[PDB]
Chain length 198, copies 6
């Protein structure tokens, strides 16, 4: 059950090879499929390095380290041991913040309440508003929300924004929460396609 | 409860610092007390190295890596976070073996049965014999055992030997087991003394 | 006039020391004040490294490399030569984009036209709109604009947003331009203060 | 006569290439056959490294460094120079020790005198006892000796043990000596075979 | 016009690749033709190293770094960008010196005036004498000069010597100047031939 | 007798420390006085590096590596062992060559015979001529020789030149030999002085 790894971006990861001798000499090779990999990388540093015990070391994991990590090693008994890991990664964004807040609302007409912003998450996750602590669902009348998620190409992290409009009453309290989109375990994805736009 | 670490010799260990920023710049220093340390080592490679996230990395742990690992880091909020680990280590020896076995015993007199040998353990652990599966206790008459533990100065690992003599009967079966001396958690030791022999 | 350097983030920079011998041995030391520096760094790698000719090398410049770079070297004639550089840095953001555009406007009432977004600049620079190619100034009636600049703490880069509202007519064309805030040369800044908020 | 090298384990070895230019550029390649080598290693670090003068450097020699070291280099005159070394290695064990000694012997019956132990030799070498300084040969009656040599798989070094039994007299003195098995020069060995045990 | 580089020996050189992404991952390879290269070197350290932005770094340029530097990179838009540099190098020699000077000349006969020496130039450049500040041309009678240029095989640098003989008058002043042979731009050379001397 | 080392420039040198343990941990420090050293260097790479056995490694020795190499080490028995080496260095120059030779001599007047040149020696050594194999001494009449030794500041190596003039006879043969100035062992030198020239 432990061939799937979830790892926070920035932090080291060690992947063991089982069957590698505790110390050199060792017959082993690692082959990787990542965001960095064209097809497959192969070795026997600060990118990826092999420890004395044959384990694989990534000094600080990033989105580009997601994918398949495989080892093949000739074991001390002379035959081959296989290792197969799937690495997924995540980032927790900063505290969410409410920008452009209204100080006063006028009952019976629509008002821009504010925008909730989360900066720097992976994967995107979602934002939602509460009013006096209950989840608000958008309707077409008394409420509507425009949300934008935009990804930073220089880091791969996401920014969410959620802008609330309401048509009201007396004295309500509001707040926003960010729920990361991570599930329990392993979602399954097709290989990607890339059509051209004419 | 996790400031104590037990680690198998040969294998990498990562110790986190809590409070270090996820990435550089960081104000932090590690200070170590080990078998290598005279008093205290200090840094901010293949001996000991600091990862991008500020964590401490030992590429392959050995007996000489036992001791105290401390971090002090100036946290992102501006004040100081402390880390304190105690590292202990172990090695599993090879399969035990019986050497110099007797093919035949003569009832009513003492016979050298054989020596059970374990090679390459840390800490020493112990050897014990079974006869038809039950633990044998030594007595002064029908049985006696001479045992020797000797440590390799070039590796720190131990060799145990246990030589059985018996005074017997019909048709008994014998075998030896090695029980490592590791307990659950944390034994407590005085600082050592070193008197001179006149 | 060349003691000030402007350098694009990501790219290498070489700073010469004048007076250093063309090759070793050399008596010289570099001392740095940067975003990384607490007070002053000192040396005689991928952070900062000294080349064979005594020059200073930064392998990929970033915002954290802004500041003062000083060399002191004992010259071939036996006396001392001083070097003093001031490094400033920049990033060009991605192409600006218009998000949430309106397809139709109604004359005589205010309409949300769209938001112009620039992602990933340093320093921030500014956004401005044109209508049929002329600069629009905001007024209080026929036009107003809300703009937000937000900085990414994990990279130091900025995101600008500019949201246009208009009160109109027949058939206008719109577009937005991003003007980086860099000037010709050397603006001068006070040392910073950091009061506490009660 | 100097193409054979004998080297103590732990210590550096430099092997020259003759014909390599005193400095770069150089056309040369080293190919090795060792305990580490599957077939042949090839290069033009702390495992094996090439010095500026083209010589081969092993930072600390071990049993695994035994074998064939070959260089081929394109010489300054344009044609090829060949180098061929055979490396053999050794370790001196610790002082021998006598364990389990008897304080008293009874004349006319056999007595276990003691075990002489040597720890940490390569190659094994041998142990022998003296009584009042003369070599003892084993017989079947007045003396017999059981000896064991056991090799440490984690280091390749050997432990010898020699257990003396005697059938005596008045007042003899005993002592043991360790004679390393190294000869003058170059013993010759067949390539090994490895049959299977059914 | 900037695909030709002239660089002083000893000093670093950075060659950019255009089209390489500002940061990793990048698909690119450098191939070099130099004095070090047999045919072509290829990579994706202190010899030649690739910076984070994909640029090529030579830590201290020498005569052996003259030649062709090519990059091929898969650009961020997915297709290929080519780079092509031609590197030439130079060294300024030391101050010229006059050796073996005559204190007195006798009119009407030839006298050895002195030798002007320049040490350590690349390319060779030339020496010439002035008498009361005017260029002297050699004739067959009143003047003649023997000059020697000799190159140091261990460095590639040149030594020039120029020995003046004159047939004189009253009170002339003499001095020598060294004019480096560098031109403006790019001389063009055939590929070399190497006939054998019988 | 082996605390003095003579080493050819360009080639590696290993200096042992005696008393250092065969392997880490070790308490030792090296302190050096060389052409590179201002006063004394201290350590516990390609400049100078310490091997696993505690020995000192210079990867390619040069004139700048001449001087005093000292080790101090805390030995396995707990007390201190001292090491003290004196390193001297040399270079063999290229084959000597005769330049500017005369094809014909006229008896009864002086003739410039030729210059013998040696390039690239350390220490300087000397040049001498033979005529039909016998050493020529200079006189004031039938022979005289002007010799020049000039040192390359960029390498420290020497160039010798020896220019022969003779006043002759029938059919003599000439040749020149270079005799390096190295003696057997250890010349002794005062510490240097450096007066100023007014």
């Amino acid at each position: 059950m432990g061939q799937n790894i979830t790892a926070r971006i920035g932090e080291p990861l060690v992947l063991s090879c089982k069957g590698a001798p505790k110390k050199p000499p060792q017959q082993l090779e690692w082959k990787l499929n990542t965001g960095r990999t064209e097809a497959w990388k192969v070795l026997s540093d600060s990118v990826a390095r092999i420890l004395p015990n044959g384990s694989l070391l990534l000094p600080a994991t990033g989105i580009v380290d997601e994918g398949t990590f495989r080892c093949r090693a000739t074991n001390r008994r002379g035959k081959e041991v296989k290792s197969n890991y799937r690495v997924r990664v995540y980032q927790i964004p900063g505290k969410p913040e409410i920008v452009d807040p209204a100080s006063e609302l006028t009952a019976s007409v629509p008002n821009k309440v504010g925008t909730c912003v989360s900066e720097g998450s992976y994967p995107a996750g979602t934002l939602s508003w509460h009013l006096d602590g209950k989840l608000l669902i958008p309707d077409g009348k008394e409420t509507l929300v425009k949300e934008e998620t935009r990804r930073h190409p220089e880091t791969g992290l996401f920014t969410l924004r959620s802008e609330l409009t309401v048509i009201p009453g007396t004295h309500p309290t509001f707040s926003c929460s960010f729920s990361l989109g991570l599930p329990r375990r392993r979602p399954l994805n097709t290989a990607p396609i890339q059509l051209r736009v004419r």
